[PDB]
Design a protein around this nucleic acid. Sequence first.
RNA 1: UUGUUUUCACUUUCUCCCCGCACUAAUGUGGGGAAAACUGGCUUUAUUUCUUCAAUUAUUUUUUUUGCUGAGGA
RNA 2: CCUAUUAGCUGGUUAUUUUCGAAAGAUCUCUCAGGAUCGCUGGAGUUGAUUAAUAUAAUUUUACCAGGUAGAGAUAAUGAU
RNA 3: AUUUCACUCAUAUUAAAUAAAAUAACUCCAAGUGGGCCAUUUUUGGUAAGCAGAACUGGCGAUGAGGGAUGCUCCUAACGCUUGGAUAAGGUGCCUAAAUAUUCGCUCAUGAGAUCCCAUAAAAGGUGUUGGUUCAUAUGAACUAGCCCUGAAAAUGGAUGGCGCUAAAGCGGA
RNA 4: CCUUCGAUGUCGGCUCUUCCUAUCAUUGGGACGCAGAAGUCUCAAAGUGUCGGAUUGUUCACCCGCUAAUAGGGAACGUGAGCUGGGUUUAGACCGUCGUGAGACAGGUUAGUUUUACCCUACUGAUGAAUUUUAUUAUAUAUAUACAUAUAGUA
RNA 5: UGCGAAGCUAAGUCUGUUGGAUAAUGGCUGAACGCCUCUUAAGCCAGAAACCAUGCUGAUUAAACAAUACUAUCUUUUUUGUUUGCUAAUGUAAAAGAGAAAUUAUAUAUGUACCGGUACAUAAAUAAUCCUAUCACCUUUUUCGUGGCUAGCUGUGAGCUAGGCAAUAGUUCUUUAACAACAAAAAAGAGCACAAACUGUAGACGACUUU
Lengths: 185, 201, 337, 125
Amino acid sequence: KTIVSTQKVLIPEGVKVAINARKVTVSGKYGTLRRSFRHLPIDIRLNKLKKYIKVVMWFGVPDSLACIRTVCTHLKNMFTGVTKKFLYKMRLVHAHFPINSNIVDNNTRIEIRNYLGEKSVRFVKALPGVVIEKSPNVKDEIYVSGADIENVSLTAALIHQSVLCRNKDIRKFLDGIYVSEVTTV
Amino acid sequence: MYKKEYVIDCKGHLLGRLASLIAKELLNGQRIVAVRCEDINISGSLYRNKLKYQEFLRLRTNTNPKKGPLHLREPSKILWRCVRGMLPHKTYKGQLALKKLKVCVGMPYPYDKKKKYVLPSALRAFRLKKHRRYCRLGTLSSRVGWNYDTLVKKNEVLRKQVSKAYYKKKVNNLNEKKEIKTEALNLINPEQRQVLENFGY
Amino acid sequence: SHRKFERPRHGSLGFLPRKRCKRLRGKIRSFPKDDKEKPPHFTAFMGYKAGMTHIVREVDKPGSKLHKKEIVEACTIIECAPMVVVGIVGYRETPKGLRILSTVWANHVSDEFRRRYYKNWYKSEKKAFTKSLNVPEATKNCLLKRIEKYCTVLRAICHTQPSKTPLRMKKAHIMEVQINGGSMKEKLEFVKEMLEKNLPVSTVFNPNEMIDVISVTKGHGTKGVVSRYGVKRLPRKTHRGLRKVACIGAWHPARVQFQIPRHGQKGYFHRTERNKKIYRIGLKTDKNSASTDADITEKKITPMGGFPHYGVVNEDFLLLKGCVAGTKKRPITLRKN
Amino acid sequence: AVKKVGKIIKKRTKKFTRFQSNRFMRVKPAWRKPRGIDCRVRRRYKGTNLMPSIGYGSNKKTKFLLPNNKYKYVVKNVKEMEPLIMNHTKYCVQIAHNVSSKKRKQIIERAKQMNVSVINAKARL
RNA sequence: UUGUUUUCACUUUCUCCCCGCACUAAUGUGGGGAAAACUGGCUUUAUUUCUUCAAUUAUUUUUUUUGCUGAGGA
RNA sequence: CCUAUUAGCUGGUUAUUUUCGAAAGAUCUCUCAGGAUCGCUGGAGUUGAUUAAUAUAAUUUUACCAGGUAGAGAUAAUGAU
RNA sequence: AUUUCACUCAUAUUAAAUAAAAUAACUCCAAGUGGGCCAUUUUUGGUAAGCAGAACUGGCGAUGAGGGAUGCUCCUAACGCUUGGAUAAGGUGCCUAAAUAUUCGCUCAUGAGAUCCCAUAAAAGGUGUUGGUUCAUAUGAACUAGCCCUGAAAAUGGAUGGCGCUAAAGCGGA
RNA sequence: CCUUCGAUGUCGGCUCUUCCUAUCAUUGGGACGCAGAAGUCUCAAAGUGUCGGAUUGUUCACCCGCUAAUAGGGAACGUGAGCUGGGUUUAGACCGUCGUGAGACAGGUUAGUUUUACCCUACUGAUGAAUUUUAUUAUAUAUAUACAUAUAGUA
RNA sequence: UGCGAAGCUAAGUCUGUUGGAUAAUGGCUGAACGCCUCUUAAGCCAGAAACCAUGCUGAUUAAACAAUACUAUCUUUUUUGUUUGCUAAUGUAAAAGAGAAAUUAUAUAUGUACCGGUACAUAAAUAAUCCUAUCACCUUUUUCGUGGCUAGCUGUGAGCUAGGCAAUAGUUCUUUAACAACAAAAAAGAGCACAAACUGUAGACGACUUU
Ligand SMILES: [Mg+2]
Ligand SMILES: [Mg+2]
Ligand SMILES: [Mg+2]
Ligand SMILES: [Mg+2]
Ligand SMILES: [Mg+2]
Ligand SMILES: [Mg+2]
Ligand SMILES: [Mg+2]
Ligand SMILES: [Mg+2]
Ligand SMILES: [Mg+2]
Ligand SMILES: [Mg+2]
Ligand SMILES: [Mg+2]
Ligand SMILES: [Mg+2]
Ligand SMILES: [Mg+2]
Ligand SMILES: [Mg+2]
Ligand SMILES: [Mg+2]
Ligand SMILES: [Mg+2]
Ligand SMILES: [Mg+2]
Ligand SMILES: [Mg+2]
Ligand SMILES: [Mg+2]
Ligand SMILES: [Mg+2]
Ligand SMILES: [Mg+2]
Ligand SMILES: [Mg+2]
Ligand SMILES: [Mg+2]
Ligand SMILES: [Mg+2]
Ligand SMILES: [Mg+2]
Ligand SMILES: [Mg+2]
């Protein structure tokens, strides 16, 4: 039982943070993210004058410490999102049949069509507040982006799932739509 | 348990412990209105609880299931069942005790306006370490086919506004009373006033 | 030991208590979910089964061996004299189910309707509704307001006009009909507009609509296991008798099980058949009612010599594809899907 | 239970009824001691009929005394009355069931003269 | 193998200095180093109703409420 | 009818309280569902004891023997190895 | 060797303790019984068995009472009828009289665990967590044993006795 | 060899239900000596299904054929007041071997009475009173009120 | 024999859903373990003929209940009572002040004011509290509120002011004190069902359907 264990998360420059009872809310250039931590025991305290926020845990086994670290990481991610959107660059790879990747509904909902040539539509709606753009630069790829690292990632995963082919040898058929690069803007 | 009728606000309580507390009181001889039984908690994870309840559901009577374990799945009814489990309900006394218990979902027509007590021996806050999985009973019930959860929530929300309104008025009244006391401490006698001051009032 | 050769059970356990229905007038167990985007409309309608005819229909199914060809199909005919609206009932949703706030009645309620509130009309002084009919409009208005405020669901009390049918019974059939539409206020308005007046079926259903038909089945009294469940006849050789179930059950659950087929009531069961197509909605004011583009001959729907065991359909009617539960003369409730 | 009145302690007001006398008419309530393997009364299981026992006996000093504190003496005849002229506080007469009304009256009269209590003076009254 | 000799290690701080210059869970702090004897310990001289005179045993004595019992008849 | 034949086998075998209270070992038995005889039990009785004794004890001390099971041994014997 | 005389051996602590040791011996008469069964420990046959067969002792039988939910044999303890007390085994969240006692740990289980006989679980695993031990350069190893997990599948529905319990009402202590 | 010998009707089929999963198929997956197809191993799964015949009293078995598949089991080796009675297990009879013989055969073959529900429950349907120490999710003109409502009878 | 309506009937005709939350599994963020990690932590996602709803049958399975329609007396107050089978009539599983309506989190809440956020208050042994009891009737003064009628009067509740006015039952034996029901006495207000005949959408008989 380690009496005190701490962690220091440096808030960036153009970020309006506001925790209360582990209900952290961060605002900035891109989006206002709110994400509660009221399932682990933790007195996350804010310093507004200086930068940084301190996550601190009294007692608790290594589990608690781990949780604290996780929390800190999450906070960092949130901060990053609000400063600069997360940009999951998803390249679609095909063998024979080119995948038709039609974005609709204000760059939410990406209709995927002609995956291994089946003439049937795969709908994959994005989570709350996460734009799905297609390539300006290269030909194939798809940018998924929008502040909450969790949500964009989730969206990407969903997209991937929507593609992945069923009863065949998956080592042979490499066709699909995969996360190339996790980045920021 | 010397009151006529205790209303128990079941929110934030641990099912079993709460039930146990109720049962003894009932036996002793004490009407108990367990109110707001949607918000009772169980100490397992949600999934675990569901599994247990699923298992329970599975045990019907093979021959003719009209008889045999009735799977009452309103949260209030679950609570009632639990309470019964801890009573000698096959006697007369036990039966009487059982009858004495009323349970409700949300809070209705007298039990809005009654004082709501709390059993702190059976409070989730005091009885589970915060790194443990718990589960809201209402959610569990919903998962196992109760349906009237959202409606109940809505009703509760509606009630809360009313309560708030009432509370404001109450607060105002209290303030007024305080003011009067302040005014009318000066107008009594000296010695009496002094005495009053000495004993708190 | 295991049963040597596996087979599916004989009855459906989904229709147990195979007991008589409580009333001839099939009850609608549930009404369509409310879609508050659409205008307010009725969801149900009572009619009497008159008989069946057959029909000839050209088919459209591209790909069928029955594509361009004319086909013959059986169809029930359901006489559908305009239902009359008499009340509005307001429900409110509780953790104990729907509870009624009130019912608001028309000012004038038909003699037919009143007959339902008596089992001996001939003897009675027919006092039913005679004080309610009187009541002042202010109270009604208040009730309506209350309903608007609190009630989440509206039903209309409608009744049939069996006098306008060959049926023997002067008693009305009274039925609650959920109204599904946008705002409760809107619904209320609609019912007010309706109130004392008549609903014909065209106000409720359309050509080619898919409808559920809810009715009490034809009765056969106490029937054997063979008829009631389609249990196999035992062989000729059998001593005590052939038309029974050889083994009720195993020894050990020492209790006959509710899943074992037994002699007893068959028919006069309540039943909702689903997905019955309306092929045509007839009109009372149409002498060319059973006529068609291909026919072009004045035909009323009534067959020569009249619908056997029913009579003469002289009013608006539904042509439903296929079959419907119950007998000629039976009340049927048609419900939107 | 125990039934104190003064110095008279009775340990057992309830009669010991025969086992199962309640169940079969043919089995009369008169105590009979159950022989027989497996009896349950014989074996003295909680909740069954009790077995009369010498523990239940009344104190040697008060034994046959009635609530009166007087030993009952049954009397058929005036001559018999005479033994209790010297014991009129310790013994109380009961007149025998078969004594005639006239004779009963006579006996009662004698008892009054003696100051001796008669427990059934009211017979044929 | 015991007693004994010496070695340097161990205490406080709301003290002070230097570096890190608010870096800390902390109304402070990480490291490095001083200071002193308020702290603590000891040595004394007295003092015990300012507060203490424990606990455990041995040996003794009494008390606050109190429940049940009254056999017998020398 | 002899005859109420015989049955080591089955069933039944009638008030109360008090007191004491077993055995299902053993030997022999055409014996193994039985019997006899010991054992254990009750009653009867006598001699005793009634003297904090002596007899006596499912007890222990103190002496004193008897032992070849646990263990141990295999470069002690026999038999393995 | 026997006999009769001598002289003299502890004794009220009684030729070592202790003894509701004479409730003893002995004789008589007779009853019932002579199918046994179970538990620890030792033990034979048998893969084993709630199997067959023995030894020591105790039980059951013949025996209720309190506990082990329940139970011929396990634990406590053997029974005249009462009042009061104070315990035993066992318990003390409720059922259920008594602790939601105190105190220190451990344990989360997507089929937890829960108390002799007893109503089942193993080999083998686990970068689950908790302590250790032995080693090397605050990390890397190897082990180790606690609880937990897997291993863990059977037929009516379902049983730590039930409800339930997770800052235990679980496991191990005090 | 614990229970049952003052009887628990002793095989199999027919019928009929339910349960199990140790999954044959179907749903969703994971692995491969998975290129595709086919298949093999395996996880959640017992929701749905698992047949027609020939021979045998058969269980079991073995073929023919369909099938998505023709998985395995239990329930007093489910099920005789449900049947059937082909078999085994009475009395008749035949053969074979054995026995001097009467007879025996866990050898073969044939002919051979299958009783009772009107009881309680269970189940199936069919009426049906009664229900104030009982009930209540509100009613009533923003306030009140469980120190309160609720007669009963027909529909 | 032939045909054979009607009624039954299959070998004849019609009809037989889509959500939630999951399992396996694949993933996401992401520690423990400066990296990695589907979680073999916390937190999430998609996902099955399974599960639970939806739908469907019953619902004297709930001794259940609601509303509506009509009806026979009902409501309020007072008094005395409940000390021929009957014709006057009593029972409480709980009265002794049975007093108490925020809400919410539990590693924080709640208000208040602005735009979930900010600032300021407030609670933090919270029923270890607060409320509410005893001032009897009286005459004499008056003061203030609430309910009725056309500023006054009556009634109730609270106060100040004056005057002593009562209670004594022999030491306690429940503190006869509550709630509900009823009976009588006065005083005040105001028709259905079954059967029967018919029916046949029903049916062993009831029941159901009708007239
Ligand atoms: Mg393939
Ligand atoms: Mg016995
Ligand atoms: Mg000093
Ligand atoms: Mg005395
Ligand atoms: Mg004889
Ligand atoms: Mg015998
Ligand atoms: Mg030897
Ligand atoms: Mg040895
Ligand atoms: Mg015996
Ligand atoms: Mg014993
Ligand atoms: Mg046990
Ligand atoms: Mg006692
Ligand atoms: Mg005690
Ligand atoms: Mg208790
Ligand atoms: Mg317990
Ligand atoms: Mg039988
Ligand atoms: Mg499986
Ligand atoms: Mg397979
Ligand atoms: Mg078997
Ligand atoms: Mg049978
Ligand atoms: Mg038979
Ligand atoms: Mg058979
Ligand atoms: Mg035969
Ligand atoms: Mg023969
Ligand atoms: Mg013909
Ligand atoms: Mg871990």
